[PDB]
Amino acid sequence: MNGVYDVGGTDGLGPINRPADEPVFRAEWEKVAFAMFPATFRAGFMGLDEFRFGIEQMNPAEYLESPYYWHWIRTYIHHGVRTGKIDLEELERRTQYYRENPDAPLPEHEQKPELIEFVNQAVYGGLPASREVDRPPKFKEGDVVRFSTASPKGHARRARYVRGKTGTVVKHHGAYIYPDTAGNGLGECPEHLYTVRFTAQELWGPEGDPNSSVYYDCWEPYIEL
Amino acid sequence: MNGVYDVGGTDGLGPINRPADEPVFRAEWEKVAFAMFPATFRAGFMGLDEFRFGIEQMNPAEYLESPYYWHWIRTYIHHGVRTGKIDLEELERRTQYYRENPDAPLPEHEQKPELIEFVNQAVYGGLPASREVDRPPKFKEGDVVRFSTASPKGHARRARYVRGKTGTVVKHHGAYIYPDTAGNGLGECPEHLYTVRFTAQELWGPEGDPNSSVYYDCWEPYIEL
Amino acid sequence: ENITRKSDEEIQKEITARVKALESMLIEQGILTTSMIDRMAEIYENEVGPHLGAKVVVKAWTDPEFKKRLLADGTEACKELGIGGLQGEDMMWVENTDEVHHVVVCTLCSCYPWPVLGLPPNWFKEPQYRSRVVREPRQLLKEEFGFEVPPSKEIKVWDSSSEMRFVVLPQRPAGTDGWSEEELATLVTRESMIGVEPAKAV
Amino acid sequence: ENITRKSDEEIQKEITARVKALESMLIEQGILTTSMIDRMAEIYENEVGPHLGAKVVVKAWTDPEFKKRLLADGTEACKELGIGGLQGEDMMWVENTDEVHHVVVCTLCSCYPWPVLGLPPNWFKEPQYRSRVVREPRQLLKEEFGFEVPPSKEIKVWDSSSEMRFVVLPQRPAGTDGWSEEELATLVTRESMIGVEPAKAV
Ligand SMILES: [Co+2]
Ligand SMILES: [Co+2]
């Protein structure tokens, strides 16, 4: 989708806010938010692409200025409510209860050894997106390709700033989960993946750095020539 | 500039908020804000293009969700402070004074007959941007032209959604004030102006309406062929 | 919803204080007076409104030669009715037919033909309409304005990127044969001349 | 500045309540436990950090054949040091030279090689860096990181649009001939491996 989140080449967002040091987690709430990445995919219902798409659908003004891990809470709720696994009315009721009783306990629950094993395994084993497919790569190193000007309303990895621009294929990586399907609940439908080099002059015209290139990863259907 | 304000073709901004009726001015503050359009250009220092550019430089999260006439206050202050005609420290002092004393009086001042004459004249006479130039139009009706992929960091009227796209020249209007100079304090440097027709498929690829076109006004340097 | 945003009451209270502060400095510099502010407001509250556009419309409906001049040069034709000036120095009027529907937008800000329509309504100036109408015009017209433009009918979107202001001449409703200029005018809306609605039926 | 935005205190207080509410429902559904949350936090607080990336760097600096394997296939080479997993299943390492400077970004979100760098710092995930580094990389490196890349030196910006994670092998600082792997490691920073800074001098 043509969301504000697609910020590559956006002007006016202002100077970088970089404190000299920071902790990994700035608040206990951030640890809870982080733990929802592996909770969401543990339950195989939703993957990383759909998780991204929930964030892309945020109120942009909220997205641009909220703490990062708020984005993770929004996307978990977005999928929760759509699948009926989260009741919004019950959630608003609980939000108010915990506004008024911040130190009220969490619900009593059994710990689960399987959740620790699942975490350790995902963290050190990874969740690989590489897939085998029956067709060979359409394209190769040195091929000069134009990125699609298609503008899907669901999830995709088509940064506005590379659309209809010309580049050179740098590397074929194999086939991977295809966002345009996986992120819209239409499954993996894996596609060959390529890194493509775009010059700064191609991307930005004469206002681009005279001696700079951007490398952007393109699934096969994103490119022709 | 590649600002968020350039919202044509942006997805995810949500449903239109349209009350069944509304007044022209929702609050007395909006009338004061409105009166700054003719106050700013009366004093020939800044024109409409520079006024637009001040808005484009707003914090996007503020721009996207603020009452419209707040944009007018931001751009007046932006030019005020840059030209040294508004002292920011004095302005913050006054903001706090009027936060704490909302019904405190405005400064005593003489009314000015010339300001009423200037208003009536601008309103019914207009502030025409059409200019005569020494060169004829480079282009004509039926010419097939590609919009520039230049990406100026100052003011321009190059909507991201038309950049590098192909259209047909529909009408030559004469020469007008050229934003890329006027809005960056570089003067009128007037250019021939054309309406160009872009198909929805050209603008959006296969996700565009199969039976729709967008008409966009292009200054001569914006187009070739 | 934005969890980071203050209440409408807190926003209005902060904007009010900032504007009164700015106004106090502009008064002291002599570039703003209470009379100047009151005159600008009075003009766009009671003098300049869509009733002006409505006269141009009903004249074009009842006068084929005036219609041709309106479509050739909107500024010059509107001057025939003493209608023109600020933010409509350059008007191009565009004709709804059975073949073509026109709708106008300012994707970059709020540009709008003040001299025929007065100041644009808030929805016109806001990001929701501006972002969507160039990309999903049929769906927007359906969902927001209950206006179904059949797929076979072309939708032309006019994006005012320049001082050229685009104004829609909507189609004359059926069943109005021989109506007075005053009767026809009751059918012409702000919306009909933006192109987000047709002129009123009946 | 945003006049519409609540205080950091009000934002934190509202987020805290919303998260505890969401957490209470996820606990009752059995898909979240206190032990699971504590384990994820403990891993990225104390087990997985840029000290891992630093080992890969100093090995490539002191081992030409390991460097070639790292540049050929970052995942396979990092597995030689028992380093890999979540959000670095597919790593491509890229080499700073006298000809070329590399800097990495996720313009679309925050994508980052967790297994070598741990979780990205907040500035990396925020719109300011993400928007600007693909468009004004030399100016950004100068203004934000005090890092002057001479105009004749090409700047390659790697935008992680896919699960491929890009990692910078920074140049070995001068004056470190024959240094131990442990001494060389004190020079390797998170920043040097994003490409926003060189490795530490001296
Ligand atoms: Co406008
Ligand atoms: Co990312």
CA distance A188 to A176: 8
SS3 at position B173: strand
| Residue from C185, C193, C164 nearest C75 by CA | C164
Tell me, yes or no, if C160 is annotated catalytic: no
Burial class (CB in 10 A: 0-12, 13-18, 19+), C66: middle
Contact, B162 vs B203, CB < 8 A?
A: yes
SS3 at position D129: helix
| Residue from B224, B204, B222 nearest B213 by CA | B204
CA distance A173 to A193: 6
Q: Which residue type is seen at A7?
A: V
The DSSP bridge pattern shows strands A191-199 and B144-147 to be: unpaired
Contact, C113 vs C167, CB < 8 A?
A: yes
CA distance B139 to B116: 42
CA distance B179 to B186: 9
What DSSP assignment string belongs to B174-222? EEE--HHHHTTTS----EEEEEEEEEHHHHHGGGS-TTEEEEEEEEGGG
Cα dihedral D32/D36/D40/D43 (nearest 10): 180
Contact, C144 vs C133, CB < 8 A?
A: no
Q: Which residue type is seen at B63?
A: Y
The DSSP bridge pattern shows strands C91-95 and A166-176 to be: unpaired
Contact, C2 vs A59, CB < 8 A?
A: yes
Length of chain D equals: 202
Q: How was this structure determined?
A: X-ray
Contact, B50 vs B156, CB < 8 A?
A: no
CA distance D184 to D174: 11
Q: After which residues is chain A broken (C to N over 2.5 A)?
A: none
The DSSP bridge pattern shows strands C154-159 and C91-95 to be: unpaired
Q: Which residue of A has its CA nearest to B153?
A: A11
Contact, C93 vs C167, CB < 8 A?
A: yes
Burial class (CB in 10 A: 0-12, 13-18, 19+), B166: middle
Confirm or reject contact between B115 and chain C (CB < 8 A): yes
Confirm or reject contact between B166 and chain A (CB < 8 A): no
| Residue from C131, C135, C113, C115 nearest C123 by CA | C131
Q: Please say whether the dihedral angle defined by the alpha carbons of residues B93, B94, B100 and B105, taken in this order, is positive or negative.
A: positive
CA distance D109 to A6: 8
The CA R_g of chain B, rounded to the nearest whole Å, is: 21
| Residue from D90, C79, B52 nearest A131 by CA | D90
C49-194 domain in CATH 3.90.330.10?
A: yes
Q: Which of B12, B13, B152 sits opposite A207 (nearest CB)?
A: B152
Q: What number of other Cβ atoms are within 10 A of residue D151's Cβ? A: 12
CA distance D94 to D105: 13
The CA R_g of chain A, rounded to the nearest whole Å, is: 21
Q: Taking CB atoms and an 8 Å cutoff, what residues of chain C touch A151?
A: 135
| Residue from A61, A60, A48 nearest A1 by CA | A60
Ligand 1: centre distance to CA A1 (Å): 25
Instruction: Tell me the β-bridge partners of A196.
Output: A169, A216
CA distance D51 to D44: 12
Take residue D60 and report the two structure tokens written for it: 């490539």
Instruction: Tell me the β-bridge partners of B172.
Output: B194
Q: Give kind and range of the element (H or E) at residue B98.
A: helix B88-100
Which of C1, C5, C6 is best to mutate for the D interface (most D CBs within 10 A)? C6
Binding site as annotated, residues of D for Co(2+): 106, 109-111
| Residue whose token pair is 């134009």 | A146
Take residue D189 and report the two structure tokens written for it: 């920073």
Cα dihedral A47/A51/A53/A57 (nearest 10): 150
Instruction: Tell me the β-bridge partners of C152.
Output: none
CA distance A168 to A152: 24
The DSSP bridge pattern shows strands C154-159 and D165-169 to be: unpaired
Q: What is the resolution of this structure in A?
A: 2.2
Contact, C102 vs B44, CB < 8 A?
A: no
Q: Taking CB atoms and an 8 Å cutoff, what residues of chain A touch C5?
A: 61-62
The DSSP bridge pattern shows strands B166-176 and C165-169 to be: unpaired
Chain centroid offset of residue C108 CA: 15
Domain boundaries, chain D: 8-46, 49-194
The chains found to touch A (3+ Cβ pairs under 8 angstroms) are B, C, D
Take residue D70 and report the two structure tokens written for it: 């790292």
CA distance D155 to D102: 6
DSSP summary character for residue D45: I
Q: Give kind and range of the element (H or E) at residue D158.
A: strand D154-159
Ligand 1: centre distance to CA C68 (Å): 27
Q: Answer yes or no: do D28 and A119 touch at CB < 8 A.
A: no
Q: What residues contact residue B103 under an 8 Å CB cut-off, 6+ apart?
A: none
Take residue D134 and report the two structure tokens written for it: 């693909």
Take residue C114 and report the two structure tokens written for it: 């003040």
Cα dihedral C177/C179/C183/C188 (nearest 10): 40
What DSSP assignment string belongs to chain A? ---TT--TT---S-S----S---S-SSHHHHHHHTHHHHHHHSTTS-HHHHHHHHHTS-HHHHHHS-HHHHHHHHHHHHHHHTTSS-HHHHHHHHHHHHH-TTPPPPP----HHHHHHHHHHHHH----EE--SSPPS--TT-EEEE-----SS-----GGGTT-EEEEEEEEEEE--HHHHTTTS----EEEEEEEEEHHHHHGGGS-TTEEEEEEEEGGGEE-
- Helix, strand counts (H, E) of chain D: 11, 4
Take residue A77 and report the two structure tokens written for it: 């709720």
Burial class (CB in 10 A: 0-12, 13-18, 19+), B117: exposed
Contact, B34 vs C40, CB < 8 A?
A: yes
DSSP summary character for residue B161: G
DSSP summary character for residue B108: P
Q: Taking CB atoms and an 8 Å cutoff, what residues of chain A touch B1?
A: 11-12
SS3 at position D34: helix
How crowded is the C-beta side of C100, counted as CA atoms within 13 Å? 14
Take residue B11 and report the two structure tokens written for it: 């997805």
Tell me, yes or no, if C78 is annotated catalytic: no
CA distance B185 to B4: 22
Between the alpha carbon of residue D75 and those of residues A199, A225, B186, the distances in Å are: 27, 30, 53
Instruction: Tell me the β-bridge partners of A193.
Output: A174, A219
- Helix, strand counts (H, E) of chain B: 9, 6
| Residue from B172, B198, D103 nearest A200 by CA | D103
What DSSP assignment string belongs to chain C? --TTBPPHHHHHHHHHHHHHHHHHHHHHTTS--HHHHHHHHHIIIIISSHHHHHHHHHHHHH-HHHHHHHHH-HHHHHHTTT---TT-SSEEEEE--SSEEEEEE-SSS----HHHH-SPPHHHHSHHHHHHTTTSHHHHHHHHH-----TTSEEEEEE--SSPEEEEEPPPPTT-TT--HHHHHTT--HHHHHTSSPPPP-
Q: Answer yes or no: do D15 and C5 touch at CB < 8 A.
A: no
List the domains of chain A with CATH numbers. Answer: 1-126 (1.10.472.20), 130-225 (2.30.30.50)
Q: What residues contact residue A78 under an 8 Å CB cut-off, 6+ apart?
A: A54, A57
The DSSP bridge pattern shows strands B144-147 and B166-176 to be: antiparallel
